[PDB]
Structure formats: structure tokens, C-alpha cells
Amino acid sequence: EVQLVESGGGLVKPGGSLKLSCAASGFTFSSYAMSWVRQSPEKRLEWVAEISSGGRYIYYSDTVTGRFTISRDNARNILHLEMSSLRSEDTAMYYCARGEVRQRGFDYWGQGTTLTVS
Amino acid sequence: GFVGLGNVWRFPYLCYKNGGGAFLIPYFIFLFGSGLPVFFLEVIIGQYTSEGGITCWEKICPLFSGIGYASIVIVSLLNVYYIVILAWATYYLFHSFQKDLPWAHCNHSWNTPQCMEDTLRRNESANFTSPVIEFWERNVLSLSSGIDNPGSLKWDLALCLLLVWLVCFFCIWKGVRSTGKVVYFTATFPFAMLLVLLVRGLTLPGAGEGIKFYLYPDISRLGDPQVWIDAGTQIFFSYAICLGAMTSLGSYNKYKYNSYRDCMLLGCLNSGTSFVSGFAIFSILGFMAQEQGVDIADVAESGPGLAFIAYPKAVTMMPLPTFWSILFFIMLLLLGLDSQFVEVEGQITSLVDLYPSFLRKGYRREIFIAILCSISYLLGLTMVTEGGMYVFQLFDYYAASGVCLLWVAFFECFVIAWIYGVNRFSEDIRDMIGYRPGPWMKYSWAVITPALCVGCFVFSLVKYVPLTYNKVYRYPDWAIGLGWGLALSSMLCIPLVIVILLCRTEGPLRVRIKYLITPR
Amino acid sequence: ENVLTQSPAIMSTSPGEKVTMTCRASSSVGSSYLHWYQQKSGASPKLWIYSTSNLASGVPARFSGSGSGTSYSLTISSVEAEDAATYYCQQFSGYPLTFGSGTKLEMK
Ligand SMILES: [Cl-]
Incomplete structure (x- = not known):
């Protein structure tokens, strides 16, 4: 069974930083590209950052291009998301999503981590 | 839908030369283990680097950047002999404008006295020659005794070759190719013409014995190493x-x-x-x-x-x-x-990418097309003479579709599978397309295509039969050496580029190899 | 960004009724790259329809998808009580990947 568990979510000061950790198992982690999808408290889904299968192709949305960095540790099967300068319109419910085939979408999602900026 | 004088011209005679049925098993083995994966591989290299030809390997293991120069030499020799094929087609076209075709009957000047018409051949009852073979070998080819006897330059065929090079020169630049509705004509007209020949051929009396020759394999001929290379490099010929x-x-x-x-x-x-x-x-x-x-x-x-x-x-x-x-x-x-x-557009594109601003693009560049077509015509004059079929068959068997194509395909697959990385390449593929390639492509680039190319190469090098034109000519050892020289001029691009890239980069051997196999 | 304007979020339909929901895109999606996700109340989203027509695993055959280019549609043949969730359409071709708005199916 493919499982994705997210952790490291909590309340942070504005302009601070926090490190998420999508830990995944039940499948090979080096062969599937991964994305971070956040969900506002108004319940709209926004894709934050996608890393490719080896980390050489990293994409960001226009909102978090210069202040969010996504990293992967292939050895420990964990997906990270380093944040920086967390503004007020960034409080969300962060999901880790297994999006590897572009024509099958995010087939496996995980739980959520409530990033709270206040 | 792609079609050229591969499918139409080359595959029939390579199938006929290799017994018909026994050709199709290595043909489909290479098609589904090598040819489609190698074709997809080179298309991904073309789409990966936003350049053309030689410098497509600076982002895929720059130690093996001689695959670009190997492709340069292969497409140059291919241009020379494929345009003398077009010279033969033009010569048949200008001999088609009278009412009764010259190959239909044999009462002309070029015909031997031993000929009589093929319709009256079973009523003789046997060393009587068909008029189509007599026309082909004595008016088109005017076939001499060998490659040692080039005879005289056929002025008819040389002006046909000059006509088709003038058509190429006036369409590569200072002109435009087919773009609009003429593309829709030229995409289905060869298929319609081939369908007309197929419907004609099947309704001919005795087509079933020909199809039994074509389809039923002769398994003892599968041990001939000529059959495997002929089939696999017909795949690699039709896909390059x-x-x-x-x-x-x-x-x-x-x-x-x-x-x-x-x-x-x-x-x-x-x-x-x-x-x-x-x-x-x-x-x-x-x-x-x-x-x-x-x-x-x-x-x-x-x-x-x-x-x-x-x-x-x-x-x-x-x-x-x-x-x-x-x-x-x-x-x-x-x-x-x-x-x-x-192919000439690809050759010009890849040579002006070899020299982006170095003396080619900054000048007129109209004269470069003329010089390349001129020396390609002069090399095409060596195989359009009276002994022109022998030089042509040398060029076809060796220069651009021999062990050279196996060499290039094996080296591409080996580099990308092992020195670059199947997983790294699959990540690039997912970046451009959207999904990593399946285990078919992965294990074809890793195992199946290097094993097929190395096995066919070694299998012919241990069970060597010489190149024979029309089963009766034996090429002299200087002609076999010339053909191997053309193949090695296609093949030795890779190791000489390896050696010169090792010697131009300073350091110890491990540091040089490590620097040259990491992509830039 | 490729803003996917979707059907208004508050739709209220009785069970057993054939329903549909649109997904208009500002740019043009290649119709093999637009997917639909079903996110329930307080739960994670899951893949529901991929490549605008195909059905994900665990999804009943009563769901269907259609459309190409700009307008994309999710269709339920008959609504049951386990179909009360929010559906997001999502192009996944252009590198600023955008989801649609809400389409929350509430009962009567
Ligand atoms: Cl072919």
C-alpha cells in the first residue's frame, strides 16, 4: 500500500521558516516525481512546488518562486519543503502528492500539515 | 506517415538477397528490440538539447561527442549514394515518355542476341535473359566486368545526377520545400502508388509462390550473419x-x-x-x-x-x-x-552548428551549399560510371548502412544506459514528455540493443563472408578495403574524438574521464 | 497563470440525478493533462478522473469525463450519498500547475 505521511507542520511567526517532511513508503521513491500542494482555509487547492524524480527538474508556482525551496532525500524516501519569509497569505493545509506521470496526475496524496502564520 | 527509398527500394532487395522469409525474423527482432527504442532515443536527444547534431552530446556525456561526427559522416556518404539512386530514377523517368517502354521488349541496341521477351519464354521448351534485366544492366547501368573497370562516365546518368542535384540545390536554400496542400498530396501519393503496385502484384499469376518465398522462413539462413546485419541496419537505415x-x-x-x-x-x-x-x-x-x-x-x-x-x-x-x-x-x-x-538540410544544419559563427554563418553561406553539393556530386560521379553499381553497392553495404549503424546505435545505447544513466535519461524524458519510459525502452537501451548490435557485429567478424554483388561478383580486396574505409570513417569518429578529448583536457586519467563523462 | 475557472462551488442536487460540472481554462489544456480530484469533508483529495476521461482506481463507473482544449466536464450518472464532496479540476501540463475552484456537491 502506497502511504504518504506529512509532518513538521505548526504555528510559525510571519517572516519565519519551517521545514515540512513528506515521508513515503510502499513504493520506490527514486522513480516518482513529487509535488507539494497546499490548501487555503477557504478550501482552494494551489500547487506549491514539484521536484522531479532525481531532483534535477524543480518547479515552483508564481506565488512562492523565490522564497520556497523543495528538496528530496532519495536515500531516506523523504520529501522536504524549506520555507522562507512566510507572509500572511500563506497559511494553508500542505499536502504531499505523488505526481509522476503527467497524464495521470497526483494519483496518491497524503495527510495535511497545518502551516499557521500569525 | 513516413516513407522514403528505404521501404520502397532498400528493404525489397535486402529481403530478396537474404532468401525472403529468413529476413523478416531479424527484421522484426531489431524492430521491436532495437529500432523503435533507438529511434525514440535519438528523438529524445534531438528534443533535449536545443541545438543540432554534434553539440547534442554536450548535455549527454561530452566524452562521446564523436557520435555527432559519426552521424555527419554517415549522412554525407548516404547523401552521395542515395542521390545516385535518384539519378537512376530520373533516367528511368526520361525513358518512360515514349509509348512502349524500353524494358518491355528486347529488340533495341543495348540488348544481347540471347534475349527474347518474357511472355515467350515458357514456349521455348534456360540461359535466356529477361528484357527488364537487360535494360537495367545495359542501358541504365551499362554494367562492366567489375569495380576494377569503371569504363567510361555515362553522360546520360551524369546529367541526370546533375539535374537532381540542381533540384536539391535550388530547394535546400534559395527556395522552399513542400508546406501546405502539396504536403497532403505527397503524403498519400507514394502510398497510393504502392497500393496500386500491391493490388497489381497480388493479382498477377504466380504471386502466391512469391509470397511463399517472401514470408516462409529458411531457418538455416538465419545462421548467416549477413541476414541479421542486413535486417537490423535496414531498420537503422529507415529510422535514421x-x-x-x-x-x-x-x-x-x-x-x-x-x-x-x-x-x-x-x-x-x-x-x-x-x-x-x-x-x-x-x-x-x-x-x-x-x-x-x-x-x-x-x-x-x-x-x-x-x-x-x-x-x-x-x-x-x-x-x-x-x-x-x-x-x-x-x-x-x-x-x-x-x-x-x-538529409541535406540536416547535414547543413549540423555543420553550421559545428561552426556557429566560425566562417560559415558570417559569410554568404549560399556558396557553402554549392560547395557541399559540388563535392557530393563529384563523389557521386564515382558510382554513376560504367562500373557504378559496384561502387554504389560498396557505399550502400558499408558507408552508411553497415556495421557503422550498429556501431552508432550501440554506442548511443551504451552511453545513455550506463555512462549517462537510464534513470537520469528517464527523468529528462518525464520532463519533456510527461512520463518515464517503460521497461521495454529501459531494458532495450540497457541490454537488448547493445546485445543485438554487439552480437551481430561479433557474429559477422567471426563468420565473415565477403560482400558479393548479385551473388556472382566477388569484390577485390582493395574494394572491400575501400568499403571498410568508408565504414571506419563513419565508425572511427567516436574513438578518435575520445582520444583527442582526453589529450586536450589536462589532468590525470581519472580526472579527465570524470570531467568528460559528466554532462555540461 | 492558467487560471481554471470552474463551476460555482455551491451546487445542491438531489440523489439519483444526473449532474454535470464545467471547468473552463484561461489557456488551452492538451486534454490528456486535465485531471479531476475528489476531496471529501475533512479528508485529503484523491485522484478521481485522469486525462479528462479515464477513471482512477476505486472510482465507480457512474463518473464520466468529457471535453477538450478549454471546456472540460465531469458527469455523474446518478448521485448517491457517498458522492457528497468537492471536486477540483486540474491541468497538469503547463509548469505553473493550477487547480480549479471549488465545486461542492451538497444534498437536499
Ligand atoms: Cl524498412
Whole structure:
């Protein structure tokens, strides 16, 4: 069974930083590209950052291009998301999503981590 | 849908030279283990680096940047002999404008006294020559005793070759190729013409014996190493031109739209076009064997003039044969001329990418097309003479479709699978297309294609038979050495580039290798 | 960004009724790259329809998808009580990947 568990979510000061950790198992982690999808408290889904299968192709949305960095540790099967300068319109419910085939979408999602900026 | 003078001209005679049925098993083995994966591999290299040809390997293991120069030499020699094929097609076209075709009967000047017409051959009852083979070998070729006797330059064929190079020169630049509705004409007209020949051939009396020759394998002939290389490099021949088809008829146009499935669409359409043209050709050859008193494997030329024997012979069995001869050789000219526009455009693009601003682009560059076409014409004068078939068959067997194509395909697969990385390449593929390639492509690049190419290369190097034109000519050892020189000029681009890149980069051997195999 | 304007979020339909929901895109999606996700109340989203027509695993055959280019549609043949969730359409071709707005199916 493919499982994705997210952790490291909590309340942070504005302009601070926090490190998420999508830990995944039940499948090979080096062969599937991964994305971070956040969900506002108004319940709209926004894709934050996608890393490719080896980390050489990293994409960001226009909102978090210069202040969010996504990293992967292939050895420990964990997906990270380093944040920086967390503004007020960034409080969300962060999901880790297994999006590897572009024509099958995010087939496996995980739980959520409530990033709270206040 | 891709089609050229691969499917139409080359695959019938390579199948006929190798016993017919025994050719198709290595053909499909290479098609589904090597040819479609290697075609997809080179298309991904073309779409990966936003450049052309030689400098496509600076982002894929720059130690092996001699694969670009190997492709340069392969496409140069291919341009020379593929345009003398077009010279033969033009010569048949200008001999098709009278009412009764010159290969239909034998009462002309070039005919031997031993000939009589093929219709009156079974009423003789046997060393009597067919008029189509006599026309082909004595008016078109004017075939001499060997490559040692080039005889005299045929001025008819040389002006036909100059005409088709002037058509190429006035269309590569200072002109435009087919773009709009004329593309829709030239995409289905070769298929319509091949369908006409197929429907004609199957309805000929005795086509079933020709199809039994074509399809039923002779398993003892599968131990001939000529058959495996002929089939595999007919795949690599028909797909390296299909590589240029996509690249020259639109680079990065297929960007998100499935350059996996696009490649399998054109590859399967190309191989199916080969298979249909083989059905047509061998139906004609079975008809000719029933009509004459000779065997199916002896009825025509086991060499490059098969499409200039079987297809004109079938044209002579049509209503209004002048009409079908004119349009069939117009079809051959359109097919090979579009493929020649493709390959010469690829050669010019890759050489002006070899020198981006170094003395080529900054000058007029009109004169560079003229110089390249001029020396390609002068090299084409060596095989359009009276001993021109022998030099041509040397060029075809060795210069651009021999062990050189196996060398290039094995080195591409080896580099990308091992020195670059299957997983790294799959990540790049997912970046451009949207999905990593399946285990078929992965294990083909890793295991199946290097094993097939190395096995065929070693298998011919341990069980060597010499190149023989039409089963009766034995090439002299200087001619075999010249053919191996053309193959090695295609092949030794890779190790000489390895050596010069090692010696130009300073450091110890491990540091030089590590620097040159990491991509830039 | 490729803003996917979707059907208004508050739709209220009785069970057993054939329903549909649109997904208009500002740019043009290649119709093999637009997917639909079903996110329930307080739960994670899951893949529901991929490549605008195909059905994900665990999704009943009563769901269907259609459309190409700009307008894309999710269709339920008959609504049951386990179909009360929010559906997001999502192009996944252009590198600023955008989801649609809400389409929350509430009962009557
Ligand atoms: Cl072929």
C-alpha cells in the first residue's frame, strides 16, 4: 500500500521558516516525481512546488518562486519543503502528492500539515 | 506517415538477397528490440538539447561527442549514394515518355542476341535473359566486368545526377520545400502508388509462390550473419532518415504531445510500408518466376536494382504502362528527393552548428551549399560510371548502412544506459514528455540493443563472408578495403574524438574521464 | 497563470440525478493533462478522473469525463450519498500547475 505521511507542520511567526517532511513508503521513491500542494482555509487547492524524480527538474508556482525551496532525500524516501519569509497569505493545509506521470496526475496524496502564520 | 527509398527500394532487395522469409525474423527482432527504442532515443536527444547534431552530446556525456561526427559522416556518404539512386530514377523517368517502354521488349541496341521477351519464354521448351534485366544492366547501368573497370562516365546518368542535384540545390536554400496542400498530396501519393503496385502484384499469376518465398522462413539462413546485419541496419537505415524526418519537419513541435507515441506511430508506419512494399515486390517476383523458367531467388537481381526490375516489370503488366511508369518514377523522385532535402538540410544544419559563427554563418553561406553539393556530386560521379553499381553497392553495404549503424546505435545505447544513466535519461524524458519510459525502452537501451548490435557485429567478424554483388561478383580486396574505409570513417569518429578529448583536457586519467563523462 | 475557472462551488442536487460540472481554462489544456480530484469533508483529495476521461482506481463507473482544449466536464450518472464532496479540476501540463475552484456537491 502506497502511504504518504506529512509532518513538521505548526504555528510559525510571519517572516519565519519551517521545514515540512513528506515521508513515503510502499513504493520506490527514486522513480516518482513529487509535488507539494497546499490548501487555503477557504478550501482552494494551489500547487506549491514539484521536484522531479532525481531532483534535477524543480518547479515552483508564481506565488512562492523565490522564497520556497523543495528538496528530496532519495536515500531516506523523504520529501522536504524549506520555507522562507512566510507572509500572511500563506497559511494553508500542505499536502504531499505523488505526481509522476503527467497524464495521470497526483494519483496518491497524503495527510495535511497545518502551516499557521500569525 | 513516413516513407522514403528505404521501404520502397532498400528493404525489397535486402529481403530478396537474404532468401525472403529468413529476413523478416531479424527484421522484426531489431524492430521491436532495437529500432523503435533507438529511434525514440535519438528523438529524445534531438528534443533535449536545443541545438543540432554534434553539440547534442554536450548535455549527454561530452566524452562521446564523436557520435555527432559519426552521424555527419554517415549522412554525407548516404547523401552521395542515395542521390545516385535518384539519378537512376530520373533516367528511368526520361525513358518512360515514349509509348512502349524500353524494358518491355528486347529488340533495341543495348540488348544481347540471347534475349527474347518474357511472355515467350515458357514456349521455348534456360540461359535466356529477361528484357527488364537487360535494360537495367545495359542501358541504365551499362554494367562492366567489375569495380576494377569503371569504363567510361555515362553522360546520360551524369546529367541526370546533375539535374537532381540542381533540384536539391535550388530547394535546400534559395527556395522552399513542400508546406501546405502539396504536403497532403505527397503524403498519400507514394502510398497510393504502392497500393496500386500491391493490388497489381497480388493479382498477377504466380504471386502466391512469391509470397511463399517472401514470408516462409529458411531457418538455416538465419545462421548467416549477413541476414541479421542486413535486417537490423535496414531498420537503422529507415529510422535514421525518419530521425531526420521529425527534426527537419519540425524541431520541438511535438514537445508535450507524446514523442513516445509519435515515434512508434512513424516507426510502425515506416515498417508497415516496408512490409507492404515487400508484398508488392515479391508478388511481382513470383509472377516473373512463374512466367520465366527460373527460380524465384534467381529471377531478378539480388542487389540494388531489384526495384528497377520488379516494379518496372509490373508496370509493363498494367493498362497504359507509360502512365504508370511516369507516375511511379515520379513517385520515386518525390520520395527520395524529399528524403534528400531532409538529409541535406540536416547535414547543413549540423555543420553550421559545428561552426556557429566560425566562417560559415558570417559569410554568404549560399556558396557553402554549392560547395557541399559540388563535392557530393563529384563523389557521386564515382558510382554513376560504367562500373557504378559496384561502387554504389560498396557505399550502400558499408558507408552508411553497415556495421557503422550498429556501431552508432550501440554506442548511443551504451552511453545513455550506463555512462549517462537510464534513470537520469528517464527523468529528462518525464520532463519533456510527461512520463518515464517503460521497461521495454529501459531494458532495450540497457541490454537488448547493445546485445543485438554487439552480437551481430561479433557474429559477422567471426563468420565473415565477403560482400558479393548479385551473388556472382566477388569484390577485390582493395574494394572491400575501400568499403571498410568508408565504414571506419563513419565508425572511427567516436574513438578518435575520445582520444583527442582526453589529450586536450589536462589532468590525470581519472580526472579527465570524470570531467568528460559528466554532462555540461 | 492558467487560471481554471470552474463551476460555482455551491451546487445542491438531489440523489439519483444526473449532474454535470464545467471547468473552463484561461489557456488551452492538451486534454490528456486535465485531471479531476475528489476531496471529501475533512479528508485529503484523491485522484478521481485522469486525462479528462479515464477513471482512477476505486472510482465507480457512474463518473464520466468529457471535453477538450478549454471546456472540460465531469458527469455523474446518478448521485448517491457517498458522492457528497468537492471536486477540483486540474491541468497538469503547463509548469505553473493550477487547480480549479471549488465545486461542492451538497444534498437536499
Ligand atoms: Cl524498412
